[PDB]
């Protein structure tokens, strides 16, 4: 019975940590790609002005 209880608890904790890791990864990646988009908009405006 204690074997069953401990296994259930460890599986639940593992799932929770995996979901938290996914959310943090999403936050960082979205922030980085938005900064890259801002840089690209500045570049295209500069090229248009030069022309």
């Amino acid at each position: 019975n204690m074997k069953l209880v401990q296994r259930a608890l460890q599986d639940l904790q593992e799932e929770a940590d995996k979901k938290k890791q996914k959310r943090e990864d999403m936050i960082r990646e979205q922030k980085i790609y938005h900064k890259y988009l801002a840089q690209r908009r500045e570049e295209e405006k500069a090229q248009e002005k030069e022309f």
Partner: protein, 430 residues
């Protein structure tokens, strides 16, 4: 799973839309960028990246007032597709805002609210804000009510109204705007509160010790009323109330859905230092006509029912101790067929004070909603002046020019005429 939609109409609606949502963000601890440093899920909606968007649709027919929202401090918090602008406004005309101009964006908003109502797994009810003085706040808000009636049958639609003041007015056809919306909110409004501007004007003069307030200081006060109404949904309490609760326990008849809204205490930080505030010493201020937020005196009328909202460290013992002392006074009256007219609610967390606001940090508060017969006092002043204006056949050349029939004025006065008679028959004791 509780959640509610804010809807705001007009230049009054957008300005109260920003001020209400400025209170909401600091109450739930939200930076202007939209990210934190399950309470918010009532009025927000979480993104996969974690951004919380205010779940409202702002409607207006001038681009001059929405653009300041798109440019100001919270320009990234609000979704770009939620603040909806017209191309030309009605300019204080009901008929222009109803039959001719408002139909251009009646299709756009009924698609935008669907995107937010499809997100409603379970929706308590909509909140709509408007002002009777303006064109869109009278005209398009009138056609807003039938479409929300046909699309959704029994969903709750509370409203805060901005009813014209008896003496100070911003317009001449403002009574024409207000009277022609009486029939719409008669049959298509579930609950309908009223608050008048000049009743707020005297409060900031004598209670908040401010020499020259403006509409910002009025917009903070009305946002304190909507916060204490919705506080039970978001925050647990000893007695939680619902939107469905005080709808049933205040409204006796389907034709009578017009309460009066008060707030107490509303005092300065200079007056917060001296005056001790207790539960009894703040619930009595909702009875005084000086602190009333509608220019009418319930002493001439009779209390129909009473709804109390308490906020903070309010003991249920002190709730029932004051009610006994309240009921002994013969300066207030109750009808003979509502012997127990009280409904109470309790929330633990005190309200949030804003930087740049005027009220102090307080531990106890009351937001009392009492239906009275003294609304017929304030209604008779406007109904006198609508017929006084209509006696010499003025300004209707515009309304007929929009297309709508002349007889809609005559049916609207008589719809209001027997409405006063119905409000008079209830006041007769058995």
């Amino acid at each position: 799973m509780r959640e509610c939609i804010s809807i705001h109409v007009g230049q009054a609606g957008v300005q109260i839309g920003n001020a209400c949502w400025e209170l909401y963000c600091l109450e739930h601890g939200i930076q202007p960028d939209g990210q934190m440093p399950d309470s918010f899920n009532t009025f927000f909606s979480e993104t996969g990246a974690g951004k919380h968007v205010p779940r409202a649709v702002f409607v207006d027919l001038e681009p001059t007032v929405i653009d300041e929202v798109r440019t100001g401090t919270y320009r990234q918090l609000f979704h770009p597709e939620q603040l909806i602008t017209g191309k030309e406004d009605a300019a204080n005309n009901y008929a222009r805002g109803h039959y001719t101009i408002g139909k251009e964006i009646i299709d756009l908003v009924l698609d935008r609210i669907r995107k937010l109502a499809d997100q409603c797994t379970g929706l308590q009810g909509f909140l709509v804000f408007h002002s009777f003085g303006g064109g869109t706040g009278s005209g398009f808000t009138s056609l807003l009510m039938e479409r929300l009636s046909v699309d959704y049958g029994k969903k709750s639609k509370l409203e805060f109204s901005i009813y014209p003041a008896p003496q100070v007015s911003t317009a001449v056809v403002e009574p024409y705007n207000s009277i022609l919306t009486t029939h719409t909110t008669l049959e298509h409004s579930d609950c309908a509160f009223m608050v008048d501007n000049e009743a707020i004007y005297d409060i900031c003069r004598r209670n908040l010790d401010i020499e020259r307030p403006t509409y910002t200081n009025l917009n903070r006060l009305i946002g304190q009323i909507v916060s204490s109404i919705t506080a039970s949904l978001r925050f647990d309490g000893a007695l939680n109330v619902d939107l469905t609760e005080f709808q049933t326990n205040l409204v006796p008849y389907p034709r009578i859905h017009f309460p009066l809204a008060t707030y107490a205490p509303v005092i300065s930080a200079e007056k917060a230092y001296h005056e001790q505030l207790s539960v009894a010493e703040i619930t009595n201020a909702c009875f005084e006509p000086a602190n009333q937020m509608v220019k009418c005196d319930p002493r001439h009328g009779k209390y129909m029912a009473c709804c109390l909202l308490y906020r903070g460290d309010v003991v249920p013992k002190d709730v029932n101790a004051a009610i006994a002392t309240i009921k002994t006074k013969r300066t207030i009256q109750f009808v003979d067929w509502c012997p127990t007219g009280f409904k109470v609610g309790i929330n633990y967390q005190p309200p949030t004070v804003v930087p740049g606001g005027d009220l102090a940090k307080v531990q106890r508060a009351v937001c009392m909603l009492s239906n009275t017969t003294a609304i017929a006092e304030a209604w008779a002043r406007l109904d006198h002046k609508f017929d006084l204006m209509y006696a010499k056949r003025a300004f209707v050349h515009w309304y007929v020019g929009e297309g709508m029939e002349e007889g809609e004025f005559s049916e609207a006065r008589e719809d209001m005429a027997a409405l006063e008679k119905d409000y008079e028959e209830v006041g007769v004791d058995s």
